[PDB]
């Protein structure tokens, strides 16, 4: 029968899904908030429109949560070591792709908001650039949804 330790890699999957996704959403919210704050002195109106980098960093945290809860609700003491390895893979995949999307949304957010203060046309541009970052979190999620449900 299955090894007594088998659930460890499954839990590290549930954990990594949330840890690295909160790190992604944290850097994505820290850089975004920094850019919003430093921009507000010169263009106070743009703070409301310029929240969207933060809101997409939040989506990377939720892409962690969806997998961390899906894995957590899947665990059992009798878990096969193969099933735990799927969950570990799902965890590192969404977790570190969320981290990667967080790095992208962070830098794009900061530069995008500072540029938008100087040129209002940049707004539509940086929204598209953020979408091309947030989709990394989604691709992390797709792979992690697949792996958790095979």
């Amino acid at each position: 029968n299955n090894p007594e330790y088998s659930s460890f890699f499954g839990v590290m999957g549930a954990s990594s899904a949330m840890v690295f996704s909160a790190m992604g959403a944290a850097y994505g919210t820290a850089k975004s908030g920094t850019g919003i704050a430093a921009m507000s002195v010169m263009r106070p109106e743009l703070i409301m429109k310029s929240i969207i980098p933060v809101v997409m960093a939040g989506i990377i945290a939720i892409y962690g949560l969806v997998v961390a809860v899906l894995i957590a609700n899947s665990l059992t003491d009798g878990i096969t070591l193969y099933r735990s390895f799927l969950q570990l893979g799902a965890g590192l995949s969404v977790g570190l792709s969320g981290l990667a999307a967080g790095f992208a949304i962070g830098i794009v957010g900061d530069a995008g908001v500072r540029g938008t203060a100087q040129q209002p046309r940049l707004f539509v541009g940086m929204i598209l650039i953020l979408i091309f970052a947030e989709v990394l979190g989604l691709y992390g999620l797709i792979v992690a949804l697949i792996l958790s449900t095979k």
Binding site: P3, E4, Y5, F8
Partner: protein
């Protein structure tokens, strides 16, 4: 920066590996391995003891060397505009040499306690020969690292006195009080290394 990224990379990689090993031997129920009892019996008492002697002289001499260059570099530099410095401030050097000398004293004291013992089975080696091997290592690190830290400390405060004594000749005889407090650390290293060493025998 360059070399410090290498030391960081070696350090973090090593402790990351030791987390993964310490997890994996635990979770896989392999804690019958990692037997620190094998490690601390198979590693010969002779090795611990001679590293202890070698670090007792050497780390003390490293402490005296940083002592001498830290105070010596400033004595010379301040001496350019005040040649008298080379009299009085030689006392910060004499204290650094005394930190080396606490090294040679204890490294000879530990040396004259270590003997061959003609055995290799841990039961035939017996607790005595291990307690000597460990105590002479610890005594060696205790004098060695205490003298390292003492010697850098007297170097720094010796450089202190030497740059003060450039600008006002009345200061040196008073700043020496912190060189007495710096020198106490080397002698406390000695006192503990003596007490560790005092109960050992080999044979």
């Amino acid at each position: 920066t360059g070399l410090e990224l290498l030391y960081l990379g070696i350090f973090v990689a090593f402790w990351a590996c030791m987390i993964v090993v310490g997890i994996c031997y635990t979770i896989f129920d392999l804690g019958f391995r990692f037997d620190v009892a094998w490690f601390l019996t198979e590693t010969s008492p002779f090795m611990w003891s001679n590293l202890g002697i070698g670090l007792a002289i050497s780390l003390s001499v490293v402490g005296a060397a940083w002592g001498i260059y830290i105070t010596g570099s400033s004595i010379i530099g301040g001496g350019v505009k005040a040649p008298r410095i080379k009299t009085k401030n030689l006392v910060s050097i004499i204290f650094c040499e005394a930190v080396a000398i606490y090294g040679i004293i204890m490294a000879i004291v530990i040396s004259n306690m270590a003997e061959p013992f003609s055995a290799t089975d841990p039961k035939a080696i017996g607790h005595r020969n291990y307690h000597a091997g460990y105590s002479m290592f610890g005594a060696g690190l205790t004098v060695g690292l205490s003298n390292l830290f003492c010697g850098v400390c007297v170097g720094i405060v010796g450089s202190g006195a030497a740059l003060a004594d450039a600008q006002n000749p009345s200061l040196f005889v008073k700043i020496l009080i912190v060189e007495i407090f710096g020198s106490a650390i080397g002698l406390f290293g000695v006192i503990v290394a003596i007490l560790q060493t005092s109960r050992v025998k080999m044979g």
